[PDB]
Amino acid sequence: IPEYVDWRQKGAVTPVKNQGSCGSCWAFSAVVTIEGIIKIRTGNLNEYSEQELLDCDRRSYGCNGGYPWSALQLVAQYGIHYRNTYPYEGVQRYCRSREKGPYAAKTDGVRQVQPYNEGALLYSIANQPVSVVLEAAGKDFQLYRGGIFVGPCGNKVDHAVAAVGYGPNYILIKNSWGTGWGENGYIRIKRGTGNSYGVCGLYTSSFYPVKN
After folding, report:
1. Among 69, 96, 92, 68, which residue's Cα sits nearest to residue 81?
2. What does each C-alpha distance from 18 to 154, 171, 179 come to in angstroms?
3. Element (H, E) at 130
4. In terms of CATH, what superfamily is 1-212?
5. Catalytic residue from among 22, 56, 81, 159
6. β-strand 186-190 against 170-174: which pairing, if any?
7. 172 pairs with which residues across the strands?
8. Helix (H, G, I), strand (E, B) or coil at 65
9. Residue 203 in contact with residue 43, Cβ under 8 Å?
10. Catalytic residue chosen out of the listed positions 56, 81, 153, 175
11. Could you tell me the residue ranges of all domains in the chain?
């Protein structure tokens, strides 16, 4: 795999979003990976609906938190609508998939990266954007403005985001806190520290969609 990957340069990443106060990060993370794999497989970059996953993933807890893997399982089992059809409201409401016409996109399954393995995560990122988790609670992450982030941070993961690239010393992360946070909404997190958790627990739990 190459020394640098940046899915933004391949036109496979949509603009940075702001989830607001709702604990919907798991839905935003999952959508980034759907947006990416559909561009990779079909050539078209579309925005898909975080709100649909928020409303309709019965295994998750709406704005109280959730699971990227169940959100991705939902998209493989049913499908997902365009963001424009099902825009983001920042609050969980009734599942309205059936009232909004046919699904826009569908995937075929979900896979997990082997946890606590930096190389396995980089291998998956070279193939597509990947949903990852990290510890965001610390003020250093909250206040991050730029540069390759080394912490301080623990490994008590609490926030789902998407890995969309990497380089020799970092993994490139698309956050869902708007374009005013970090590097126009992105963070570069240090890699290669030899800690199997990853910096801020980045290697704990990573999933990606499968599309034939």
Report:
1. 96
2. 24, 21, 8
3. strand 130-134
4. Cysteine proteinases (3.90.70.10)
5. 159
6. antiparallel
7. 165, 188
8. coil
9. no
10. 175
11. 1-212
Q: Which two tokens mark 107?
A: 């995937």
Rg (CA), the chain: 16
Q: Which residues contact 74 (CB under 8 A, 6 or more apart)?
A: 53, 56, 57, 80
Contact predicate 154/201, CB 8 Å: yes
| 63 appears as a binding residue in the annotation | no
AA identity, residue 185: G
Q: Which of 25, 56, 153, 200 is catalytic?
A: 25
User: Does 175 qualify as catalytic in the annotation?
Assistant: yes
25-42 and 68-77 helices, crossing angle to 10°: 50
Structure tokens at 74: 């939902």
- Residue 121 token pair: 């995560």
The yes-or-no answer on residue 184 being catalytic is no
Q: What is the resolution of this structure in A?
A: 1.6
Other Cβ atoms less than 10 A from the Cβ of 199: the count is: 24
**3-state secondary structure (DSSP) of residue 1:** coil
Which structural technique was applied? X-ray
Distance between CA atoms of residues 86 and 204, nearest Å: 31
Identity of the amino acid at 140: D
